[PDB]
Amino acid sequence: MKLSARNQLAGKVVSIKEGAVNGIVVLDIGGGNQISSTISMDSIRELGLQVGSDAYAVIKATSVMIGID
Amino acid sequence: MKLSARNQLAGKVVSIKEGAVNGIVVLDIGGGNQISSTISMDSIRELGLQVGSDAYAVIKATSVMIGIDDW
Amino acid sequence: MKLSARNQLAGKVVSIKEGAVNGIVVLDIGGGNQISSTISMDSIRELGLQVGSDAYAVIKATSVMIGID
Amino acid sequence: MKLSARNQLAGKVVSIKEGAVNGIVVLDIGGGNQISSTISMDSIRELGLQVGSDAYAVIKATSVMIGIDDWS
Amino acid sequence: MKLSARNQLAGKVVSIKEGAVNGIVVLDIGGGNQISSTISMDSIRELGLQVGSDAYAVIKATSVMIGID
Amino acid sequence: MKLSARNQLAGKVVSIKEGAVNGIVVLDIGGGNQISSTISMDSIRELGLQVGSDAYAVIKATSVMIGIDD
Protein backbone atom coordinates (compact mmCIF):
# COMPACT_ATOMS: atom_id res chain seq x y z
CA MET A 1 0.00 0.00 0.00
CA LYS A 2 1.02 3.65 -0.40
CA LEU A 3 0.10 5.86 2.59
CA SER A 4 -0.95 9.49 2.93
CA ALA A 5 1.11 9.92 6.13
CA ARG A 6 3.61 12.73 5.63
CA ASN A 7 6.30 10.98 7.70
CA GLN A 8 7.68 7.64 6.48
CA LEU A 9 11.24 7.33 7.81
CA ALA A 10 13.41 4.40 6.75
CA GLY A 11 15.42 2.73 9.48
CA LYS A 12 16.67 -0.47 11.06
CA VAL A 13 15.16 -2.09 14.12
CA VAL A 14 17.62 -1.97 17.02
CA SER A 15 15.36 -3.30 19.82
CA ILE A 16 11.94 -4.76 20.59
CA LYS A 17 10.50 -4.71 24.11
CA GLU A 18 7.61 -7.17 24.14
CA GLY A 19 4.50 -6.95 26.25
CA ALA A 20 1.30 -8.98 26.50
CA VAL A 21 -0.73 -7.01 23.92
CA ASN A 22 1.68 -4.28 22.74
CA GLY A 23 5.39 -3.90 22.21
CA ILE A 24 7.83 -1.03 21.71
CA VAL A 25 9.97 -1.07 18.56
CA VAL A 26 13.01 1.22 18.40
CA LEU A 27 14.16 2.20 14.91
CA ASP A 28 17.53 3.73 13.98
CA ILE A 29 16.69 6.12 11.14
CA GLY A 30 20.27 7.41 10.76
CA GLY A 31 22.05 10.62 11.63
CA GLY A 32 21.83 9.77 15.31
CA ASN A 33 18.03 9.80 15.30
CA GLN A 34 15.91 7.02 16.76
CA ILE A 35 12.14 6.64 16.74
CA SER A 36 10.19 4.54 19.23
CA SER A 37 6.88 2.96 18.13
CA THR A 38 4.28 1.48 20.49
CA ILE A 39 2.20 -1.01 18.44
CA SER A 40 0.34 -4.29 18.91
CA MET A 41 2.31 -7.47 19.43
CA ASP A 42 0.13 -8.94 16.70
CA SER A 43 1.48 -6.42 14.20
CA ILE A 44 5.07 -6.96 15.43
CA ARG A 45 4.77 -10.68 14.64
CA GLU A 46 2.86 -10.14 11.40
CA LEU A 47 5.60 -7.82 10.08
CA GLY A 48 8.32 -10.31 11.08
CA LEU A 49 10.16 -7.58 12.98
CA GLN A 50 13.52 -8.49 14.49
CA VAL A 51 16.64 -6.72 15.64
CA GLY A 52 18.20 -5.79 12.30
CA SER A 53 14.98 -5.62 10.26
CA ASP A 54 14.60 -2.84 7.72
CA ALA A 55 11.39 -0.88 8.30
CA TYR A 56 9.82 2.60 8.35
CA ALA A 57 8.53 4.81 11.15
CA VAL A 58 5.17 5.99 9.83
CA ILE A 59 3.65 9.09 11.41
CA LYS A 60 0.66 11.18 10.39
CA ALA A 61 1.52 14.88 10.38
CA THR A 62 -1.34 15.66 12.82
CA SER A 63 0.47 13.48 15.40
CA VAL A 64 3.69 15.55 15.33
CA MET A 65 4.06 18.48 17.72
CA ILE A 66 6.81 21.10 17.56
CA GLY A 67 8.98 21.98 20.55
CA ILE A 68 11.63 24.67 21.18
CA ASP A 69 14.29 25.23 23.83
CA MET B 1 9.14 21.12 30.76
CA LYS B 2 10.43 17.56 30.40
CA LEU B 3 8.10 15.39 28.34
CA SER B 4 7.35 11.66 28.39
CA ALA B 5 7.13 11.52 24.58
CA ARG B 6 9.72 8.99 23.41
CA ASN B 7 10.41 10.93 20.21
CA GLN B 8 11.95 14.42 20.48
CA LEU B 9 14.03 14.97 17.34
CA ALA B 10 16.00 18.20 16.89
CA GLY B 11 15.78 19.99 13.57
CA LYS B 12 15.49 23.28 11.70
CA VAL B 13 12.35 24.78 10.16
CA VAL B 14 12.49 24.48 6.36
CA SER B 15 8.98 25.71 5.61
CA ILE B 16 5.73 26.83 7.17
CA LYS B 17 2.51 26.51 5.18
CA GLU B 18 -0.17 28.63 6.85
CA GLY B 19 -3.89 27.89 7.03
CA ALA B 20 -6.79 29.47 8.90
CA VAL B 21 -6.61 27.42 12.12
CA ASN B 22 -3.72 25.01 11.41
CA GLY B 23 -0.40 25.11 9.59
CA ILE B 24 2.19 22.58 8.44
CA VAL B 25 5.75 22.94 9.75
CA VAL B 26 8.51 21.01 7.94
CA LEU B 27 11.63 20.20 9.99
CA ASP B 28 15.02 19.15 8.60
CA ILE B 29 16.21 16.67 11.23
CA GLY B 30 19.43 15.57 9.54
CA GLY B 31 20.49 12.35 7.91
CA GLY B 32 18.47 13.55 4.93
CA ASN B 33 15.19 13.17 6.85
CA GLN B 34 12.43 15.73 7.31
CA ILE B 35 9.32 15.57 9.49
CA SER B 36 6.03 17.34 8.73
CA SER B 37 3.91 18.54 11.65
CA THR B 38 0.31 19.80 11.47
CA ILE B 39 -0.33 22.11 14.44
CA SER B 40 -2.51 25.09 15.28
CA MET B 41 -1.57 28.50 13.86
CA ASP B 42 -1.75 29.98 17.35
CA SER B 43 0.98 27.56 18.47
CA ILE B 44 3.06 28.43 15.40
CA ARG B 45 2.84 32.09 16.48
CA GLU B 46 3.32 31.50 20.21
CA LEU B 47 6.40 29.42 19.50
CA GLY B 48 7.81 32.17 17.24
CA LEU B 49 8.46 29.72 14.42
CA GLN B 50 10.15 31.03 11.27
CA VAL B 51 12.02 29.44 8.40
CA GLY B 52 15.42 28.76 9.98
CA SER B 53 14.18 28.41 13.58
CA ASP B 54 15.62 25.60 15.72
CA ALA B 55 12.94 23.26 17.03
CA TYR B 56 12.02 19.63 17.75
CA ALA B 57 9.59 17.15 16.22
CA VAL B 58 7.81 15.65 19.23
CA ILE B 59 5.92 12.38 18.80
CA LYS B 60 4.23 10.08 21.30
CA ALA B 61 5.30 6.47 20.83
CA THR B 62 1.67 5.35 20.52
CA SER B 63 1.37 7.58 17.45
CA VAL B 64 4.12 5.79 15.45
CA MET B 65 3.32 2.86 13.20
CA ILE B 66 5.91 0.56 11.61
CA GLY B 67 5.96 -0.36 7.95
CA ILE B 68 8.10 -2.78 5.90
CA ASP B 69 8.66 -3.14 2.17
CA ASP B 70 7.39 -6.75 2.31
CA TRP B 71 8.74 -7.43 -1.20
CA MET C 1 4.56 -1.02 2.11
CA LYS C 2 2.91 -3.34 4.60
CA LEU C 3 1.74 -1.34 7.61
CA SER C 4 1.40 -2.36 11.24
CA ALA C 5 -1.97 -0.60 11.62
CA ARG C 6 -4.64 -3.09 12.62
CA ASN C 7 -7.32 -1.29 10.60
CA GLN C 8 -6.95 -1.17 6.78
CA LEU C 9 -10.44 -0.92 5.29
CA ALA C 10 -10.90 -0.97 1.53
CA GLY C 11 -13.43 1.46 0.10
CA LYS C 12 -14.30 3.96 -2.59
CA VAL C 13 -14.05 7.74 -2.25
CA VAL C 14 -17.50 9.35 -2.21
CA SER C 15 -16.50 12.93 -1.36
CA ILE C 16 -13.46 15.18 -0.94
CA LYS C 17 -13.75 18.49 0.94
CA GLU C 18 -10.76 20.70 0.12
CA GLY C 19 -9.41 23.14 2.69
CA ALA C 20 -6.33 25.34 2.95
CA VAL C 21 -3.88 22.78 4.38
CA ASN C 22 -6.06 19.74 5.11
CA GLY C 23 -9.02 18.05 3.46
CA ILE C 24 -11.66 15.52 4.46
CA VAL C 25 -11.90 12.29 2.43
CA VAL C 26 -15.02 10.15 2.85
CA LEU C 27 -14.72 6.42 2.04
CA ASP C 28 -17.62 4.03 1.45
CA ILE C 29 -16.26 0.78 2.94
CA GLY C 30 -19.39 -1.32 2.31
CA GLY C 31 -22.09 -2.61 4.60
CA GLY C 32 -23.52 0.89 4.81
CA ASN C 33 -20.41 2.17 6.60
CA GLN C 34 -18.39 5.24 5.71
CA ILE C 35 -15.17 6.55 7.23
CA SER C 36 -14.04 10.17 7.23
CA SER C 37 -10.32 10.97 7.15
CA THR C 38 -8.82 14.43 7.76
CA ILE C 39 -5.40 14.52 6.04
CA SER C 40 -3.11 17.10 4.44
CA MET C 41 -3.96 18.50 1.00
CA ASP C 42 -0.49 17.55 -0.19
CA SER C 43 -1.26 13.89 0.53
CA ILE C 44 -4.65 14.10 -1.19
CA ARG C 45 -2.89 15.35 -4.32
CA GLU C 46 0.12 13.02 -4.10
CA LEU C 47 -2.17 9.99 -3.82
CA GLY C 48 -4.25 11.17 -6.82
CA LEU C 49 -7.48 10.86 -4.81
CA GLN C 50 -10.73 11.64 -6.64
CA VAL C 51 -14.40 10.86 -6.15
CA GLY C 52 -14.60 7.23 -7.24
CA SER C 53 -10.97 6.31 -6.43
CA ASP C 54 -10.27 2.99 -4.74
CA ALA C 55 -8.50 3.52 -1.44
CA TYR C 56 -8.11 2.30 2.16
CA ALA C 57 -8.97 3.78 5.55
CA VAL C 58 -5.91 3.17 7.75
CA ILE C 59 -6.26 3.47 11.53
CA LYS C 60 -3.91 2.46 14.33
CA ALA C 61 -5.67 0.37 16.96
CA THR C 62 -4.58 2.80 19.70
CA SER C 63 -6.63 5.49 17.94
CA VAL C 64 -9.97 3.61 18.19
CA MET C 65 -12.26 4.00 21.18
CA ILE C 66 -15.26 1.82 22.02
CA GLY C 67 -18.71 3.16 22.83
CA ILE C 68 -22.04 1.62 23.88
CA ASP C 69 -25.60 2.98 23.91
CA MET D 1 -23.22 12.00 25.21
CA LYS D 2 -23.16 12.92 21.57
CA LEU D 3 -19.57 12.89 20.26
CA SER D 4 -17.85 14.99 17.65
CA ALA D 5 -15.97 11.99 16.24
CA ARG D 6 -16.83 11.65 12.56
CA ASN D 7 -16.45 7.85 12.78
CA GLN D 8 -18.91 6.00 15.08
CA LEU D 9 -19.40 2.55 13.57
CA ALA D 10 -21.91 0.11 15.03
CA GLY D 11 -20.78 -3.49 15.42
CA LYS D 12 -20.64 -6.58 17.59
CA VAL D 13 -17.69 -7.70 19.71
CA VAL D 14 -16.17 -10.91 18.33
CA SER D 15 -13.10 -11.06 20.60
CA ILE D 16 -11.39 -9.39 23.58
CA LYS D 17 -7.66 -9.86 24.24
CA GLU D 18 -6.97 -9.01 27.88
CA GLY D 19 -3.62 -7.63 29.06
CA ALA D 20 -2.35 -6.03 32.29
CA VAL D 21 -3.28 -2.38 31.59
CA ASN D 22 -4.74 -2.47 28.07
CA GLY D 23 -6.73 -4.87 25.91
CA ILE D 24 -7.73 -5.22 22.26
CA VAL D 25 -11.43 -5.32 21.31
CA VAL D 26 -12.35 -6.58 17.84
CA LEU D 27 -15.68 -5.34 16.48
CA ASP D 28 -17.50 -6.85 13.50
CA ILE D 29 -19.10 -3.83 11.81
CA GLY D 30 -20.66 -5.72 8.90
CA GLY D 31 -19.85 -5.88 5.23
CA GLY D 32 -16.89 -8.13 6.02
CA ASN D 33 -15.09 -5.37 7.96
CA GLN D 34 -13.69 -5.60 11.47
CA ILE D 35 -12.22 -2.82 13.62
CA SER D 36 -9.60 -3.42 16.31
CA SER D 37 -9.50 -1.02 19.27
CA THR D 38 -6.73 -0.84 21.91
CA ILE D 39 -8.17 0.64 25.12
CA SER D 40 -7.59 0.37 28.85
CA MET D 41 -8.73 -2.72 30.74
CA ASP D 42 -10.61 -0.45 33.15
CA SER D 43 -12.68 0.87 30.22
CA ILE D 44 -13.40 -2.67 29.04
CA ARG D 45 -14.69 -3.50 32.54
CA GLU D 46 -16.70 -0.29 33.07
CA LEU D 47 -18.50 -0.77 29.75
CA GLY D 48 -19.22 -4.41 30.57
CA LEU D 49 -17.84 -5.45 27.19
CA GLN D 50 -18.19 -9.16 26.43
CA VAL D 51 -18.05 -11.27 23.30
CA GLY D 52 -21.37 -10.61 21.59
CA SER D 53 -21.98 -7.13 23.06
CA ASP D 54 -23.25 -4.36 20.81
CA ALA D 55 -20.86 -1.42 20.61
CA TYR D 56 -19.36 1.27 18.36
CA ALA D 57 -15.87 1.88 17.05
CA VAL D 58 -15.28 5.59 17.65
CA ILE D 59 -12.53 7.27 15.63
CA LYS D 60 -11.60 10.90 15.29
CA ALA D 61 -11.27 11.89 11.65
CA THR D 62 -7.78 13.28 12.29
CA SER D 63 -6.69 9.74 13.25
CA VAL D 64 -7.54 8.19 9.86
CA MET D 65 -4.98 7.98 7.04
CA ILE D 66 -5.69 7.00 3.43
CA GLY D 67 -3.88 4.36 1.41
CA ILE D 68 -3.85 3.26 -2.24
CA ASP D 69 -2.46 0.17 -3.93
CA ASP D 70 1.21 0.00 -4.86
CA TRP D 71 0.43 -0.07 -8.59
CA SER D 72 -1.68 3.11 -8.62
CA MET E 1 -23.48 7.13 23.91
CA LYS E 2 -21.14 5.98 26.71
CA LEU E 3 -17.45 6.13 25.76
CA SER E 4 -14.38 4.15 26.80
CA ALA E 5 -12.24 7.31 26.75
CA ARG E 6 -10.74 7.73 30.22
CA ASN E 7 -10.88 11.55 30.00
CA GLN E 8 -14.33 13.21 29.82
CA LEU E 9 -14.11 16.72 31.26
CA ALA E 10 -17.19 18.93 31.71
CA GLY E 11 -16.94 22.58 30.75
CA LYS E 12 -18.37 25.58 28.91
CA VAL E 13 -17.29 26.77 25.47
CA VAL E 14 -15.45 30.10 25.83
CA SER E 15 -14.18 30.43 22.23
CA ILE E 16 -14.63 28.95 18.75
CA LYS E 17 -12.16 29.80 15.98
CA GLU E 18 -13.54 28.63 12.64
CA GLY E 19 -11.58 27.32 9.68
CA ALA E 20 -12.37 25.85 6.26
CA VAL E 21 -12.56 22.14 7.21
CA ASN E 22 -11.62 22.28 10.91
CA GLY E 23 -12.16 24.59 13.84
CA ILE E 24 -10.74 24.97 17.35
CA VAL E 25 -13.12 24.88 20.35
CA VAL E 26 -11.87 26.15 23.71
CA LEU E 27 -13.61 24.73 26.80
CA ASP E 28 -13.24 26.22 30.27
CA ILE E 29 -13.37 23.14 32.53
CA GLY E 30 -13.01 24.96 35.87
CA GLY E 31 -10.04 25.52 38.15
CA GLY E 32 -8.50 27.92 35.64
CA ASN E 33 -7.87 25.21 33.02
CA GLN E 34 -8.96 25.38 29.39
CA ILE E 35 -8.84 22.60 26.84
CA SER E 36 -8.55 23.35 23.14
CA SER E 37 -9.98 20.85 20.67
CA THR E 38 -9.26 20.80 16.93
CA ILE E 39 -12.23 19.06 15.25
CA SER E 40 -14.09 19.19 11.95
CA MET E 41 -16.33 22.16 11.23
CA ASP E 42 -19.08 19.60 10.52
CA SER E 43 -18.85 18.38 14.11
CA ILE E 44 -18.93 21.93 15.46
CA ARG E 45 -22.13 22.67 13.53
CA GLU E 46 -23.69 19.28 14.21
CA LEU E 47 -23.10 19.56 17.95
CA GLY E 48 -24.60 23.07 17.86
CA LEU E 49 -21.60 24.49 19.73
CA GLN E 50 -21.68 28.19 20.54
CA VAL E 51 -19.97 30.43 23.02
CA GLY E 52 -21.70 29.42 26.23
CA SER E 53 -22.56 25.82 25.22
CA ASP E 54 -22.06 23.13 27.85
CA ALA E 55 -19.86 20.33 26.57
CA TYR E 56 -17.16 17.80 27.43
CA ALA E 57 -13.53 17.49 26.42
CA VAL E 58 -13.08 13.83 25.50
CA ILE E 59 -9.54 12.44 25.35
CA LYS E 60 -8.26 8.88 24.98
CA ALA E 61 -5.67 7.98 27.62
CA THR E 62 -3.14 6.95 24.94
CA SER E 63 -3.29 10.53 23.64
CA VAL E 64 -2.16 12.07 26.96
CA MET E 65 1.54 12.60 27.70
CA ILE E 66 3.07 13.52 31.06
CA GLY E 67 5.49 16.36 31.64
CA ILE E 68 7.51 17.61 34.63
CA ASP E 69 9.51 20.75 35.38
CA MET F 1 11.15 22.36 26.44
CA LYS F 2 8.27 24.55 25.17
CA LEU F 3 5.56 22.61 23.36
CA SER F 4 3.03 23.57 20.71
CA ALA F 5 0.47 21.28 22.38
CA ARG F 6 -2.39 23.57 23.36
CA ASN F 7 -3.31 21.51 26.45
CA GLN F 8 -0.86 21.52 29.38
CA LEU F 9 -2.64 20.86 32.69
CA ALA F 10 -0.85 20.90 36.07
CA GLY F 11 -1.63 18.15 38.59
CA LYS F 12 -0.46 15.63 41.17
CA VAL F 13 0.05 11.92 40.53
CA VAL F 14 -2.53 9.99 42.54
CA SER F 15 -1.84 6.55 41.03
CA ILE F 16 0.35 4.60 38.61
CA LYS F 17 -0.84 1.23 37.25
CA GLU F 18 2.25 -0.55 35.93
CA GLY F 19 2.34 -2.93 33.01
CA ALA F 20 5.14 -4.64 31.11
CA VAL F 21 5.64 -1.90 28.46
CA ASN F 22 3.13 0.85 29.30
CA GLY F 23 1.61 2.27 32.46
CA ILE F 24 -1.37 4.43 33.33
CA VAL F 25 -0.69 7.61 35.31
CA VAL F 26 -3.71 9.24 36.94
CA LEU F 27 -3.25 12.93 37.63
CA ASP F 28 -5.44 14.95 39.97
CA ILE F 29 -5.75 18.35 38.32
CA GLY F 30 -8.13 19.79 40.94
CA GLY F 31 -11.77 20.75 40.86
CA GLY F 32 -12.65 17.07 41.13
CA ASN F 33 -11.04 16.31 37.75
CA GLN F 34 -8.53 13.61 36.87
CA ILE F 35 -6.56 13.00 33.69
CA SER F 36 -5.40 9.49 32.79
CA SER F 37 -2.25 9.01 30.72
CA THR F 38 -1.13 5.77 29.05
CA ILE F 39 2.62 6.08 28.40
CA SER F 40 5.68 3.84 28.20
CA MET F 41 7.13 2.41 31.40
CA ASP F 42 10.49 3.80 30.28
CA SER F 43 9.00 7.29 30.41
CA ILE F 44 7.48 6.77 33.87
CA ARG F 45 10.91 5.74 35.15
CA GLU F 46 12.74 8.44 33.17
CA LEU F 47 10.63 11.22 34.68
CA GLY F 48 10.92 9.66 38.13
CA LEU F 49 7.14 9.75 38.45
CA GLN F 50 5.77 8.46 41.74
CA VAL F 51 2.56 8.89 43.71
CA GLY F 52 2.66 12.49 44.91
CA SER F 53 4.83 13.88 42.10
CA ASP F 54 3.87 17.22 40.57
CA ALA F 55 3.47 16.88 36.82
CA TYR F 56 1.48 17.95 33.75
CA ALA F 57 -1.02 16.30 31.44
CA VAL F 58 -0.04 17.28 27.88
CA ILE F 59 -2.52 16.88 25.00
CA LYS F 60 -2.30 17.97 21.37
CA ALA F 61 -5.43 19.84 20.33
CA THR F 62 -6.04 17.45 17.42
CA SER F 63 -6.35 14.61 20.00
CA VAL F 64 -9.35 16.16 21.80
CA MET F 65 -12.94 15.50 20.83
CA ILE F 66 -15.93 17.48 22.09
CA GLY F 67 -19.09 15.84 23.39
CA ILE F 68 -22.47 17.21 24.57
CA ASP F 69 -25.42 16.01 26.61
CA ASP F 70 -28.24 14.72 24.46
Author numbering:
A (entry chain F), C (entry chain B), E (entry chain C): 1 to 69
B (entry chain E): 1 to 71
D (entry chain A): 1 to 72
F (entry chain D): 1 to 70
Sentences from the paper on this structure:
Here, we characterized E. limosum Tub, a tungsten storage protein. Tub has a sub-nanomolar affinity for tungstate and contains a single TOBE domain first characterized in a molybdate storage protein. Crystal structures revealed Tub assembles as a hexamer composed of a trimer of dimers, capable of binding eight tungstate oxyanions at two distinct binding sites located at inter-subunit interfaces. Tub enables E. limosum to accumulate W and then supplies W for two tungstoenzymes needed for conversion of lactate to SCFAs.
Additional X-ray crystal structures of rTub occupied with varying amounts of W revealed that tungstate accesses the internal type-2 binding sites through tunnels that are closed after binding. With seven tungstate bound, all six type-2 binding sites are occupied and one type-1 site. Tungstate simultaneously binds to type-1 and type-2 sites indicating random binding, except for the final binding site located within the trimer center.
